[PDB]
Write an enzyme that holds these catalytic residues in place. Structure first.
Site, PDB file in Angstrom:
ATOM      1  CD  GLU A   1     -14.527  -3.851   2.949  1.00  0.00           C
ATOM      2  OE1 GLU A   1     -14.894  -2.703   2.534  1.00  0.00           O
ATOM      3  OE2 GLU A   1     -13.685  -4.518   2.344  1.00  0.00           O
TER       4      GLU A   1
ATOM      5  N   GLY B   1     -19.383  -3.978  -6.282  1.00  0.00           N
ATOM      6  CA  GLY B   1     -19.039  -2.674  -6.866  1.00  0.00           C
ATOM      7  C   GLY B   1     -17.580  -2.593  -7.339  1.00  0.00           C
ATOM      8  CB  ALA B   2     -14.707  -1.475  -7.081  1.00  0.00           C
TER       9      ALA B   2
ATOM     10  CG  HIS C   1     -10.082  -1.001   1.104  1.00  0.00           C
ATOM     11  ND1 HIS C   1     -10.326  -1.324   2.428  1.00  0.00           N
ATOM     12  CD2 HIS C   1     -11.214  -1.317   0.424  1.00  0.00           C
ATOM     13  CE1 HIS C   1     -11.570  -1.756   2.553  1.00  0.00           C
ATOM     14  NE2 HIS C   1     -12.130  -1.777   1.351  1.00  0.00           N
TER      15      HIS C   1
ATOM     16  CD  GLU D   1     -10.134  -4.163  -0.782  1.00  0.00           C
ATOM     17  OE1 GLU D   1     -11.091  -4.156  -1.584  1.00  0.00           O
ATOM     18  OE2 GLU D   1     -10.165  -4.710   0.390  1.00  0.00           O
TER      19      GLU D   1
ATOM     20  CD  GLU E   1     -12.269  -8.608   0.396  1.00  0.00           C
ATOM     21  OE1 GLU E   1     -12.022  -7.721  -0.429  1.00  0.00           O
ATOM     22  OE2 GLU E   1     -12.550  -8.366   1.583  1.00  0.00           O
TER      23      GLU E   1
ATOM     24  CG  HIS F   1     -14.812   1.843  -0.187  1.00  0.00           C
ATOM     25  ND1 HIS F   1     -15.600   1.792   0.942  1.00  0.00           N
ATOM     26  CD2 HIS F   1     -14.256   0.613  -0.329  1.00  0.00           C
ATOM     27  CE1 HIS F   1     -15.528   0.576   1.460  1.00  0.00           C
ATOM     28  NE2 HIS F   1     -14.717  -0.151   0.711  1.00  0.00           N
ATOM     29  CD  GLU F   2     -13.255  -0.814  -3.488  1.00  0.00           C
ATOM     30  OE1 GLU F   2     -12.569  -1.467  -2.656  1.00  0.00           O
ATOM     31  OE2 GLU F   2     -14.488  -0.843  -3.505  1.00  0.00           O
TER      32      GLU F   2
HETATM   33  C1  LIG Z   1     -17.890   1.889  -1.756  1.00  0.00           C
HETATM   34  C2  LIG Z   1     -17.810   0.453  -1.314  1.00  0.00           C
HETATM   35  C3  LIG Z   1     -18.718   0.222  -0.094  1.00  0.00           C
HETATM   36  C4  LIG Z   1     -18.203  -0.392  -2.522  1.00  0.00           C
HETATM   37  C5  LIG Z   1     -18.044  -1.862  -2.256  1.00  0.00           C
HETATM   38  N1  LIG Z   1     -16.644  -2.236  -2.203  1.00  0.00           N
HETATM   39  C6  LIG Z   1     -16.275  -3.189  -1.396  1.00  0.00           C
HETATM   40  O1  LIG Z   1     -17.109  -3.706  -0.628  1.00  0.00           O
HETATM   41  C7  LIG Z   1     -14.819  -3.641  -1.559  1.00  0.00           C
HETATM   42  O2  LIG Z   1     -13.922  -2.695  -0.911  1.00  0.00           O
HETATM   43  C8  LIG Z   1     -14.678  -5.046  -0.997  1.00  0.00           C
HETATM   44  N2  LIG Z   1     -13.281  -5.259  -0.518  1.00  0.00           N
HETATM   45  C9  LIG Z   1     -14.932  -5.969  -2.166  1.00  0.00           C
HETATM   46  C10 LIG Z   1     -15.686  -7.233  -1.854  1.00  0.00           C
HETATM   47  C11 LIG Z   1     -17.034  -7.205  -1.461  1.00  0.00           C
HETATM   48  C12 LIG Z   1     -17.715  -8.394  -1.225  1.00  0.00           C
HETATM   49  C13 LIG Z   1     -17.077  -9.603  -1.389  1.00  0.00           C
HETATM   50  O3  LIG Z   1     -17.784 -10.783  -1.171  1.00  0.00           O
HETATM   51  C14 LIG Z   1     -17.257 -11.994  -0.639  1.00  0.00           C
HETATM   52  C15 LIG Z   1     -18.437 -12.899  -0.373  1.00  0.00           C
HETATM   53  C16 LIG Z   1     -18.364 -14.265  -0.660  1.00  0.00           C
HETATM   54  C17 LIG Z   1     -19.459 -15.093  -0.413  1.00  0.00           C
HETATM   55  C18 LIG Z   1     -20.630 -14.554   0.118  1.00  0.00           C
HETATM   56  C19 LIG Z   1     -20.729 -13.187   0.406  1.00  0.00           C
HETATM   57  C20 LIG Z   1     -19.617 -12.368   0.157  1.00  0.00           C
HETATM   58  C21 LIG Z   1     -15.750  -9.624  -1.794  1.00  0.00           C
HETATM   59  C22 LIG Z   1     -15.035  -8.443  -2.038  1.00  0.00           C
HETATM   60  C23 LIG Z   1     -18.783  -2.699  -3.256  1.00  0.00           C
HETATM   61  O4  LIG Z   1     -18.191  -3.540  -3.934  1.00  0.00           O
HETATM   62  O5  LIG Z   1     -20.079  -2.509  -3.397  1.00  0.00           O
HETATM   63 ZN   LIG Z   2     -14.104  -2.066   0.933  1.00  0.00          ZN
END
Ligand SMILES: CC(C)C[C@H](NC(=O)[C@@H](O)[C@H](N)Cc1ccc(OCc2ccccc2)cc1)C(=O)O
Ligand SMILES: [Zn+2]
Ligand SMILES: [Mg+2]
Length: 889
Positions: free
Chosen positions: A324, A265-266, A305, A268, A124, A301-302
């Site tokens: 999200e 952070g993580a 999803h 899914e 992602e 959270h994950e």
């Molecule tokens: C608890 C939760 C809010 C934690 C949170 N997790 C999530 O955002 C996941 O579910 C997302 N699918 C994972 C995700 C997040 C960002 C991401 O960038 C893509 C990108 C590319 C270029 C520029 C900016 C961003 C990809 C995946 C956590 O990782 O901090």
């Molecule tokens: Zn998410």
């Protein structure tokens, strides 16, 4: 760079039905063979076949097993593979390729990469195309058959999505596993993991179908004893989705894997969630308290999803908030239920109104569903996540629990293993709205404005009470400031949960009531109101708005003491502090500007100080809530209220307010710090890995907050308490002992003691680095240099970089040093980081988000550093785009 517009969405002229991957990991390279079973869609106009493919080294490509030849039949520019239309079949065909990639040197941590000794993917949003060619967009749904091979001794554990259908040995000491995942999924949900992983596991039996689900949590061997809380969190998550939503997990197994190097952070990925170790691993000995809530949040959270994102999918990245913001909302409901503390909700509100409000008044302001983007930074934001979550929570507020659940289930049942858009969600909620209002006339068309309109609404109040008539009126206005996205802002559907408190006895005067404000202004009249009430407005923080309560400080104090809603009490306290901060700030500012030889400051309201003491000394009041009342509003919250903010002046204002209150309450604070010890630091369950007491952790939060207050104040003999605190078994305590010792000669002795305690646990070391970075030290710049030379070095681990630098950027006096040296230091780090990780380099830009909100000298200094960064010949697309948007170029 290409600008993508929401309105331009069109389905591909191709279909990808099946992906068959062979991923052969070697010492110096990974070989990826891929066969795509493809088709021509009804939208095809005989265009070129164009695949995304970034940084791939082509060994071969073929169509129907006929090798294609470069220049004649395809071109490849390191971003796009083009197969000229004359060579593309007109019915079902197989595309195959073999490419070479290099996870060992992939320090950008997107696509396939090596984290310490684990190979891991991150796809992602657009990372799949760094692994193999694809039409890399979330509406291309396919089946996956994936085989991974690797050196068995180095990579004994091989994981991907789906069922493991075969395991086999290979000559040369290698081995393979094949995973078949027949349900369709978008490619951003593909994952693979290979490593020497150790695990904990459990079996979960689903609530209704009674399906046995195997749960595996994995980490490197060193940290496997830190996995137990995650597994407990996973069980809790699954039970909550069953209990609240009636949703069970659909697959045979769920794997969670911790890796050391991770951009966020993580993630899914379906059946194979991959985590930053800092959001999966914890122990009582080696983690601070914060880890426990964090892991609960991120596992939850994950997990959520799996429905909102994985089973109901996005058609395109403009709908990101639908997975999200909705998933954040689901995790908030979960965490609120799991923790049973009011501080779960307050902490989320605290973040939104500081960080997201800042974003929404910045040159980066966007609606939660943007109309265009050049980079994914335009989507993965606090606005899309956190304001999106509040937009999702407003449906629950409007509908109440029964009808919300009914509407949610409509959305799931209608869209399960299709793609959905925000309109599909609004539709489902609207059907519930109709049922609830009892008429098909009613609609939520106006509600859709929450998805398209940027900026924070301001909601302001005037009141009227007629004592003879027993008639009370609340007159409400909404306004959103025009910005770059809408010249004319429309009124939103704002739900306003309210109470009326009798000021004589603190009692509720009306039943649960949510005012539906749908116009620019409205007046809400209540009859049979026996006495003039104090209104309790936006209970639970019921809409993501600037609340202007127009209450007196006497009315706010009465709410702080006697209201039933934690957010309103917290908000009333916040508002009393803000009125004080704005007044003292102006007094200091005038004295600085006028170069006054003497001047007066308005003291802190004594009755407010009395109210804080009343609450602190109440043994039945909540310790987490107490910690919020003795803390001033976040700097980033305060900045939303001051033009040309002089940070030094704000730092003097805070100092004065804190000292005014401490001069009255320090003995109270000391007494409480001592009386809280027994329960806060209770060791009864220290060795019970699964026993997590959120109230007890909030007691430690309060003690640690009080200790900081007392140490800043140089309360008599507080160093004795500080030194004793350094000996606590809890890292929250002993790292706190480090930070509060900054105000004493013992700082470096504690720096060494706590380093020694931290240095052999990778994550604890990161927490130590944060503690040093955040330390209120006059020699903080020299200390960072020591961290750089001795601990961080040329580490490319984003956790290490973020730990050393980000906390320091919150140091109001020092980061914003008027020489600009702080801005200079962070720009140097961003530029260095950008060479190998554009995503983390862009994260490191965070302090610059408010640049145009500061006094003109600092505005100029920050702008100068941003322009210096922009001028770097080797700047990434991601960083350039971000800084161009931020500097309004
Ligand atoms: C608890 C939760 C809010 C934690 C949170 N997790 C999530 O955002 C996941 O579910 C997302 N699918 C994972 C995700 C997040 C960002 C991401 O960038 C893509 C990108 C590319 C270029 C520029 C900016 C961003 C990809 C995946 C956590 O990782 O901090
Ligand atoms: Zn998410
Ligand atoms: Mg390391």
């Amino acid at each position: 760079p290409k600008i993508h517009y929401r309105k331009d969405y069109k389905p591909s002229g191709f279909i990808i039905n099946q992906v068959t991957l062979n991923i052969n990991i070697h010492d110096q390279e990974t070989i990826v063979r891929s066969v795509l079973d493809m088709d021509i869609s009804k939208h095809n106009v005989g265009e070129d076949l164009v695949f995304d493919g970034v940084g791939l080294k082509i060994n071969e490509i073929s169509i129907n097993n006929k090798k294609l030849v470069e220049g004649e039949e395809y071109t490849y520019d390191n971003e796009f593979l083009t197969i000229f239309s004359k060579f593309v079949p007109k019915s079902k065909f197989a595309f195959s390729s073999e490419v070479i990639i290099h996870p060992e040197t992939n320090y950008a941590l997107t696509g396939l990469y090596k984290s310490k000794n684990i190979i891991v993917s991150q796809c992602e949003a657009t990372g799949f195309r760094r692994i193999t060619f694809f039409i890399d967009r979330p509406d291309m749904m396919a089946k996956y058959d994936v085989t991974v091979t690797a050196d068995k001794e180095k990579y004994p554990v091989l994981l991907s999505n789906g069922d493991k259908v075969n395991e086999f040995e290979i000559p040369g000491g290698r081995h393979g596993a094949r995973f078949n995942d027949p349900p369709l999924k978008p490619c951003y949900l593909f994952a693979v993991v290979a490593g020497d992983l150790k695990h904990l596991s459990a079996t979960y039996i689903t609530k209704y179908t009674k399906k046995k689900v195997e749960l595996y949590v994995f980490s490197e061997e060193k940290y496997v004893s830190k996995l137990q809380w995650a597994l407990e969190c996973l069980k809790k998550s699954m039970a909550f989705d069953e209990d609240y939503f009636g949703l069970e997990y659909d697959l045979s197994r769920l794997n969670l894997v911790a890796v050391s190097d991770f951009n966020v952070g993580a993630m899914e990925n379906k059946g194979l969630n991959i985590f930053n170790a800092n959001s999966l691993l914890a122990s009582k000995k080696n983690s601070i308290d914060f880890s426990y809530a964090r892991i609960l949040t991120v596992v939850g959270h994950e997990y959520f999803h799996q429905y909102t994102g994985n089973r109901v999918t996005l058609r395109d990245w403009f709908q990101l908030t639908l997975k999200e913001g909705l998933t954040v909302h689901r995790e908030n409901l979960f965490s609120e239920e799991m923790t049973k503390t009011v501080t779960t909700r307050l902490s989320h509100v605290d973040l939104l109104r500081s960080v997201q409000f800042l974003e929404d008044s910045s040159p980066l302001s966007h609606p939660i569903r943007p109309e265009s983007y050049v980079s994914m930074e335009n989507f993965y934001t606090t606005t899309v996540y956190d304001k999106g979550s509040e937009v999702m929570r407003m449906y629950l507020t409007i509908l109440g629990e029964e009808y919300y659940k009914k509407g949610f289930d409509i959305y799931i049942k209608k869209n399960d293993g299709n793609t959905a858009t925000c309109e599909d969600f609004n539709y489902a909620m609207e059907q519930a709205y109709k049922m609830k209002k009892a008429d098909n006339s009613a609609n939520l068309n106006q509600y859709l404005l929450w998805f398209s309109q940027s900026g924070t609404p301001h909601v302001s109040f005037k009141y009227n009470y007629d004592a003879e008539k027993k008639q009370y009126s609340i007159h409400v206005n909404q306004y959103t400031k025009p910005d770059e996205n809408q010249k004319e802002k429309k009124p939103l559907f704002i739900p306003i949960s309210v109470g009326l408190i009798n000021p004589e006895n603190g009692k509720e005067m009306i039943s649960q009531t949510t005012l539906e404000l749908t116009k620019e202004s409205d007046t809400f009249v209540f009859n049979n109101i026996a006495v003039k009430p104090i209104p309790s407005l936006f209970r639970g923080f019921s809409a993501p708005v600037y609340i202007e309560d127009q209450l007196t400080d006497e009315e706010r104090i009465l709410l702080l003491k006697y209201d039933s809603d934690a957010f309103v009490r917290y908000n009333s306290c916040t508002n009393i502090y803000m009125k004080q901060i704005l007044m003292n700030y102006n007094e200091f500012l005038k004295a600085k500007n006028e170069k006054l030889e003497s001047f007066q400051l308005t003291p802190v309201n004594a009755q407010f100080i009395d109210a804080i003491k009343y609450l602190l000394e109440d043994p039945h009041a909540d310790a987490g809530f107490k910690s919020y009342i003795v803390s001033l509003p976040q700097d980033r919250y305060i900045i939303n209220f001051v033009s040309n903010l002089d940070t030094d002046v704000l730092a003097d204002t805070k100092e004065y307010i804190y000292k005014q209150i401490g001069d009255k309450l320090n003995d109270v604070y000391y007494k409480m710090f001592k009386s809280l010890e027994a329960k806060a630091d209770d060791l009864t369950y220290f060795n019970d890995e699964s026993h997590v007491d959120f109230d007890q952790m909030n007691m430690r939060t309060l003690r640690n907050t009080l200790l900081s207050l007392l140490s800043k104040a140089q309360y008599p003999n507080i160093l004795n308490e500080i030194i004793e605190h350094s000996k606590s078994p809890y890292p929250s305590n002993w790292l706190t002992s480090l930070s509060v010792s900054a105000y004493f000669d013992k700082y470096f002795e504690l720096y060494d003691k706590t380093y020694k305690l931290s240095k052999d646990d990778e994550l604890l070391l990161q927490e130590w680095l944060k503690t040093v970075s955040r330390s209120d030290r006059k020699d903080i710049y020299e200390i960072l240099k020591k961290l750089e030379n001795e601990v961080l070095k040329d580490s490319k681990n984003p956790n290490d970089i973020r730990a050393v630098y980000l906390p320091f950027t919150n140091n109001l006096r020092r980061f914003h040093d008027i020489s600009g040296k702080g801005y200079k230091l962070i720009a140097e780090v961003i530029t260095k980081t950008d060479k190998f990780n554009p995503m983390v380099a862009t994260q490191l830009c965070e302090p610059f988000k408010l640049w145009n909100k500061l006094d003109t000298k600092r505005q100029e200094l920050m702008l100068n550093e941003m322009n210096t960064m922009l001028q770097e010949p080797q700047i990434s697309n991601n960083l350039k785009e971000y800084l161009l948007r931020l500097t309004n170029k």
